[PDB]
Write a protein that binds this ligand. Structure first.
Ligand SMILES: *[C@H]1O[C@H](CO)[C@H](O)[C@H](O)[C@H]1O
Ligand SMILES: *[C@H]1O[C@H](CO)[C@H](O)[C@H](O)[C@H]1O
Ligand SMILES: *[C@H]1O[C@H](CO)[C@H](O)[C@H](O)[C@H]1O
Ligand SMILES: *[C@H]1O[C@H](CO)[C@H](O)[C@H](O)[C@H]1O
Ligand SMILES: *[C@H]1O[C@H](CO)[C@H](O)[C@H](O)[C@H]1O
Ligand SMILES: OC[C@@H]1O[C@@H](O)[C@H](O)[C@H]1O
Ligand SMILES: OC[C@@H]1O[C@@H](O)[C@H](O)[C@H]1O
Lengths: 48, 49
């Protein structure tokens, strides 16, 4: 007889194990420090 | 006509001291001056604040 045929080829192998998750972000910056207020007006002379 | 004087009103017996916040550097005067910026007077009767 001729050479007998081969066996059925395998199914496609499995995937890799997939990557991990991203590390978190750092704590956000602070808000711009506010500014002090305006000095009051010049007062008048006290009572005599 | 009658050579008699009638209306006399007396002056002051003691001198008033300048209040706090006021000064007086003149000798014979009738008021106080509120003294200028950058200076202060924290006692009554100051010659110069
Ligand atoms: C499987 O292969 C062999 C040889 O290659 C033979 O031809 C058979 O007929 C075939 O089924
Ligand atoms: C798939 O694999 C088999 C072996 O079982 C055979 O070599 C076939 O020819 C191939 O297509
Ligand atoms: C990956 O797996 C398949 C079967 O799923 C086959 O065995 C391949 O040879 C292997 O590399
Ligand atoms: C504040 O900053 C962090 C990173 O520093 C991140 O982007 C936040 O989304 C932001 O609100
Ligand atoms: C007012 O002052 C703050 C500082 O606390 C800051 O510089 C602002 O930019 C300014 O406008
Ligand atoms: O809060 C915003 C989202 O969740 C958290 C991360 O900073 C971003 O992915
Ligand atoms: O506030 C927490 C820490 O502050 C600073 C760093 O970025 C963070 O890890």
């Amino acid at each position: 007889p001729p050479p007998t045929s081969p066996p059925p080829s395998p199914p496609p192998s499995p995937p890799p194990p997939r990557p991990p998750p991203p590390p978190p972000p750092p704590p956000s910056p602070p808000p711009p420090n506010r500014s002090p207020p305006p000095p009051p007006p010049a007062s008048s002379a006290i009572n005599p | 006509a009658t050579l008699i004087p009638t209306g006399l009103v007396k002056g002051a017996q003691a001198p008033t001291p300048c209040g706090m916040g006021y000064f007086q550097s003149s000798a014979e005067t009738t008021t106080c001056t509120a003294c200028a910026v950058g200076t202060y007077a924290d006692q009554a009767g100051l010659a110069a604040c």
